[PDB]
């Protein structure tokens, strides 16, 4: 007698208990994020504590159920997911030491502070330093802030990160993974699916192959941006060298978005900002979200539940409380779907409403799944589904069709090439940054980097992979990786690279089924019912099927392809190729701003 | 007059696993008013249209009232399967009555959760028609005895519906009254 039946009954218990418990927890989390008081912090904490204790209970129930004898794939997947036990494998002492280290690092990051020689005032990342790195054109305050961050804060995290790698390497080797990097890569693992499988190292191989296919586009973006920044900082930049890490738009060069002002190809053509016309036509938050609803419904997607319209916070409360205004899409469960957003009447918040309501659409589609499979196929699917909506909604065709733009309104390639260049500064710019960050973390966990070469490798890989040189020599007393929110606080990073590639596979596929003519960026998916149906045949899956199968359900391809990304950017590609006809493409890795 | 007001307008309904039965006898019933109330999201009769059973006489009537999620209201019908149909309230294949049902979100849902209503999640076998099982014996799923306690392969057979005034329509509370009409050799005391 196969205990499969016992595991069936156990999962039937788990679904129904966890439903109410996670509903409690999500509701208390909401009430803190909608009221934000000490009472509400306490209620949210108690709800989450009951929920987390329920997991420490039920994961350890599920450990017994041997996955091997579960031939109803769903069951095996629910049990596998619940049996991802992580830190419970470690000794209680070491679980506590690692939680101690993680809390230390996270609070160091969120509370670190560096001091002006200027004002003797001691700034911080989110207030002062980020405004410096995003809005400053002075070479020297950007260098000051960059370096002071990596020194006052990065140095304190260094031994914490060493012991962190140590303990989580043990924590991974306890769950039969080869290292913590393999543990994280265990997200994309697919097993027991003839023709649809996916090993944990094929993520390595696919990421490397597709980044190789990305390299030329990035090299020409890099040459062009180096040229413009050399025009805006001549004595500091080499025409052939890497980019000084502190001059890249934010504290890390993660996104080059804040460089657009210096790198805009056509500096005098009108940028599409419909925020003025929305204010001109007496639109409010209700109107923005109604229009997003209409967009989705045009594509044969369901309407928002009235509980959504009754329970979502779409305006600055400005009544009796304060709110964490970070736009979030909530799936509390039991058919309750909500959106937090302190919405302004702006084109940015308009597209953001489309993005968050796309998260909502993904949630509502797979609500018929068993909780444990109520999620994106893998970690990057959700945000890609969110991003393709903003793509389809920022297009002239859409903006005209909703009447937020003139019916005669056209758009001049200059305008279009400006838009593509901005899109590349944000999207293409983060791809090598992210690939190399995660490659360095992965190798550190694998052991391929000795502790005493920890940064020496990092910056070599900044010179080699991302074409970015540090402006000051850094010894192992630093830990400039950990200087990013994600590394200091233990998050897998490859999700952004995979999400980027997924969103363009998706948007290309849906624009094909839409019967879209012309270049792929302007494609609207509105009114393309067929595109929405092709998309739903993936959304309703959740993670009940392998992510290779979920991807095939949209793009007909079982794996990750940059050809849709390259097709999206081919006009800007052919633009950079002829701009750079009097420039050096690539980078020598030996030039540094500090050989003087 | 028949006391349908106390079956339908009852202040609180029973949990579906202890479904309430009221016997109806020796009274005149007007069923046309129960339907033309137009306040029932479900009023589906598998015996005869509500028209003739105002023009008809039965020996006993049975009003079975309880509460179940809207998505589960499809199970209160002959020939259906699911949790509620197998382990709570079963209608026979030759069922000759009506199923009436309305949305009780304004009554059975409250902020923070209304855990008053239960339902049976596991059972050894399926119910016969019009059977009621209200035992709280821990469901043994594996082969080790439970010793009357929840644990490994050992679960309480009853779980609580969470009726919130924010749930989706299908996870909202619904009040159901199933009307059964019988004929015997005894004279018919229920007419209209
Ligand atoms: C695709 O879906 C969009 C959804 O927004 C449709 O947009 C608008 O759809 C209406 C109804 O078909 C079109 O008729 C217009 O109604 C307005 C109402 O103010 C009226 O002023 C116009 O003279 C016209 O009668 C409307 O043209 C259209 N919007 C625009 C900017 O064209 C769109 O029609 C759908 N595509 C179709 C049906 O091919
Ligand atoms: C927020 O919390 C306060 C307690 O500080 C409470 O009085 C209020 O009812 C809560 N809800 C709101 C303001 O919507």
XYZ file of C-alpha atoms and ligand atoms in Angstrom, chain A residues 294 298 400-403 526-527, ligand 1:
47
model
C -10.071 47.858 -19.390
C -9.688 44.022 -23.907
C -3.477 57.354 -28.580
C -6.183 54.690 -28.379
C -7.122 55.607 -24.802
C -7.095 59.207 -26.074
C -4.720 45.465 -26.428
C -7.737 43.867 -28.172
C -9.831 48.201 -29.105
O -10.225 48.447 -27.759
C -10.250 49.851 -27.462
C -10.519 49.981 -25.983
O -10.215 51.284 -25.505
C -11.269 50.584 -28.338
O -11.130 51.983 -28.078
C -12.216 52.819 -28.518
O -13.299 52.007 -28.872
C -14.481 52.696 -29.289
C -15.548 51.642 -29.478
O -15.211 50.730 -30.516
C -14.185 53.469 -30.564
O -15.349 54.215 -30.926
C -15.207 55.613 -30.519
O -15.976 55.944 -29.349
C -15.660 57.272 -28.868
C -16.357 57.494 -27.529
O -15.998 58.790 -27.052
C -16.063 58.316 -29.948
O -15.686 59.620 -29.521
C -15.400 57.998 -31.298
O -15.855 58.918 -32.303
C -15.640 56.541 -31.701
O -17.016 56.409 -31.942
C -12.980 54.389 -30.380
O -12.565 54.851 -31.663
C -11.777 53.673 -29.727
N -10.753 54.644 -29.365
C -9.939 55.218 -30.263
C -8.964 56.222 -29.725
O -9.993 54.948 -31.461
C -11.035 50.264 -29.814
O -12.155 50.704 -30.571
C -10.875 48.763 -30.048
N -10.515 48.504 -31.434
C -11.401 48.192 -32.394
C -12.843 48.109 -31.975
O -11.059 47.988 -33.552
